[PDB]
Amino acid sequence: RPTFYRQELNKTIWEVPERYQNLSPVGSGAYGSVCAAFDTKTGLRVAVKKLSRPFQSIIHAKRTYRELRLLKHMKHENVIGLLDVFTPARSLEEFNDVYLVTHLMGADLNNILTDDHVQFLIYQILRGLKYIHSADIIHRDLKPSNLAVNEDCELKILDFGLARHTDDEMTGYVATRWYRAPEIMLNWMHYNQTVDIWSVGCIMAELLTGRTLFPGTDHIDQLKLILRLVGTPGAELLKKISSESARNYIQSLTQMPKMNFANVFIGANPLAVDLLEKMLVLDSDKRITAAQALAHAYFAQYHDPDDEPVADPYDQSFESRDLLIDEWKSLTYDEVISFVPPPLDQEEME
Ligand SMILES: Cc1ccc(C(=O)Nc2ccon2)cc1-n1cnc2ccc(N3CCN(C)CC3)cc2c1=O
Ligand SMILES: [Cl-]
CATH class of the missing domain: 3.30.200.20 (Phosphorylase Kinase; domain 1)
Structure with a gap:
């Protein structure tokens, strides 16, 4: 010993x-x-x-x-x-x-960008994520402060799988509101691995611009900031919402039009804008996965099928x-x- x-x-x-x-x-x-x-x-x-x-x-x-x-x-x-x-x-x-x-x-992403830094870091999270998703482990609170980086811009995801699975238990874990997928914040439709993808969206937004995409002051203000960007759900998403009160907040908060992501992330790589558009959607059934994101044109530089293991x-x-x-x-x-x-x-x- x-x-x-x-x-x-x-x-x-x-x-x-x-x-x-x-x-x-x-x-x-x-x-x-x-x-x-x-x-x-x-x-x-x-x-x-x-x-x-x-x-x-x-x-x-x-x-x-x-x-x-x-x-x-x-x-x-x-x-x-x-x-x-x-x-x-x-x-x-x-x-x-x-x-x-x-x-x-x-350090971590909270401490620490050109497009090429952005491609590389996001590529790494997505590589890492794919590996966790494939073992049916969801992060559930991906955010800049749990993304540790070298001075080589090399990256390691920390603290995955600790945040509560459900209403019905508590793990004593504190999540950070600003990076959470709407559906796990408001528990308003079923949720899958792509909650992390939403978080990757908010992170990548933040790296390019320097700004927190959605700095909500509470659950509802957060919902408000989100819907100003992605736009109020249509009939097609609404029909997937179990909670009747979750629908009332949506149909009642003056119908917000989806914005042009090019105007929001101006001067950014256009392939960078397109991945954000596939990442930042409310319908968790239609959100891009980790593995599918890996193959998006934006990562043509760092991408390799046989070196993204599970x-x-x-x-x-x-x-x-x-x-x-x-x-x-x-x-x-x-x-x-x-x-x-x-x-x-x-x-x-x-
Ligand atoms: C030491 C350590 C142990 C475990 C885990 C972890 O992810 N466990 C789990 C559980 C489920 O999945 N993963 C993470 C760490 N770990 C590693 N490196 C770190 C480096 C710096 C810090 N500091 C950075 C500065 N903050 C102010 C305080 C936290 C913190 C850490 C830090 O916490
Ligand atoms: Cl997450």
């Missing part, structure tokens, strides 16, 4: 293998504090997340399990993956902390179960114990 050592870092206690050194806080990640550390084994820079009370509830306990399963399965250049997972506990009985270890990317079969039947905290805790632990690092060959990265 590793030699562990201890320190207090902004009112928390971290106990970590001696192999990670120079722990340096960088703010909150999903469900805990994050530290930059140097990884003496590999020479790599890494991010270490201490989960905050991973098992104070079924909510915490299930979510910890979820995160670790997700991380363990993702093996794709544009999707954040699991570099290491550890706990100081030497047995199940005093298993109380989980720390997750990933690569440390310079995930292995992912078991997520755990998502349907009601179990005690002690059952989630044990399952997480066995996942910890079974964990084998990624293959580290003779080559030196970063």
Whole structure:
């Protein structure tokens, strides 16, 4: 077993293998504090997340399990993956902390553009997304602050699959209103993987212009900003809306005409405008997928059929179960114990 050592870092206690050194806080990640550390084994820079009370509830306990399963399965250049997972506990009985270890990317899209930067970054998200969609995992809260980038403009999607699946459960996850597909914000028609595509739309809009496409102050104001752009639904979308109150807001908010996207994103690449038009549609049945977007003319430069791979079969039947905290805790632990690092060959990265 590793030699562990201890320190207090902004009112928390971290106990970590001696192999990670120079722990340096960088703010909150999903469900805990994050530290930059140097990884003496590999020479790599890494991010270490201490989960905050991973098992104070079924909510915490299930979510910890979820995160670790997700991380363990993702093996794709544009999707954040699991570099290491550890706990100081030497047995199940005093298993109380989980720390997750990933690569440390310079920054994120929230921090950090010419068209060619835009093609490349969006291309990467879409490549990454295709991989998650194919394993039937939906991000559900894609946004600039969970898109980590190098100084090479290389990109890795973080925090996918944490946001609540339904009305009926809570995961303690905070989404950001501005990038959410209308249909998952208002729960107003059925929803599929292309909720992420809507988010990719809002992001790509934002990169080209510098401006938040829809900075809504609440659910209704947001709906208003959206419909000013895409235009109030016709009969054809309306008939797909279950919620009668969701229809009233639409038919009542003075009928907004769809705008010319060329006027809205002026001076942008026209192929860039056309992909936005295929991405920013209300009807989630007609929205372009990750895989179909990959083949859009706009990515003619970065596109390659045989180098946009898809995930292995992912078991997520755990998502349907009601179990005690002690059952989630044990399952997480066995996942910890079974964990084998990624293959580290003779080559030196970063
Ligand atoms: C360390 C880490 C662990 C896991 C995940 C993750 O995505 N888990 C899941 C769960 C389901 O799918 N993916 C992400 C990270 N991770 C990695 N790198 C990071 C780098 C910087 C930051 N900081 C950046 C600056 N912010 C102010 C605070 C957050 C934060 C991170 C950051 O959180
Ligand atoms: Cl999303």
